[PDB]
């Protein structure tokens, strides 16, 4: 969860709204196991 600790403050002349972009990844202690098929199958009918 993300909260305002203080406030977004800006002087006269600058936009009152701005955006944040989030980038995610795994740390070096991350591993996966038990190989399986993905939940999605990207085709509806036969692919021609």
């Amino acid at each position: 969860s993300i909260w305002y600790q203080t406030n977004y403050v800006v002087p006269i002349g600058a936009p009152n709204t701005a955006y944040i972009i989030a980038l995610a990844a795994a740390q070096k202690n991350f591993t996966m196991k038990l190989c399986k098929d993905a939940s999605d199958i990207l085709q509806t009918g036969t692919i021609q």
Binding site: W3, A18, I20, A25
Partner: protein, 97 residues
């Protein structure tokens, strides 16, 4: 790192790009909530936009720490302090800061 669609709400083709970023703006100083999302990387939701989430889908089990890096794209003259929290299992969605 790949882009996490925290803002996974718009669905019309013309607004899909808006899912890639979320906003902040001047508030009332009441420690207001900006956004929330589950941290489960292989669950439906924001993480599906990430390569990690997709690769995760080919494995039944996973283990490890995750990291989310937030980049502020407002103007140079904008300042602010945000509190980002991670609530371990069992804790319901925090009602306040």
């Amino acid at each position: 790192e790949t882009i996490l669609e925290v803002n996974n709400v718009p669905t019309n083709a013309t607004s899909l790009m808006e899912r890639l970023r979320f906003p902040v703006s001047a508030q009332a100083g009441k420690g207001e909530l900006c956004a929330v999302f589950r941290a489960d990387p292989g669950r439906n939701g924001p993480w599906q936009s990430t390569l990690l989430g997709q690769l995760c889908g080919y494995y039944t089990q996973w283990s490890g720490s995750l990291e989310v890096t937030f980049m502020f794209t407002g103007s140079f003259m904008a300042t602010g302090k945000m509190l980002i929290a991670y609530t371990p299992p069992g804790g319901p969605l925090p009602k306040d800061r």
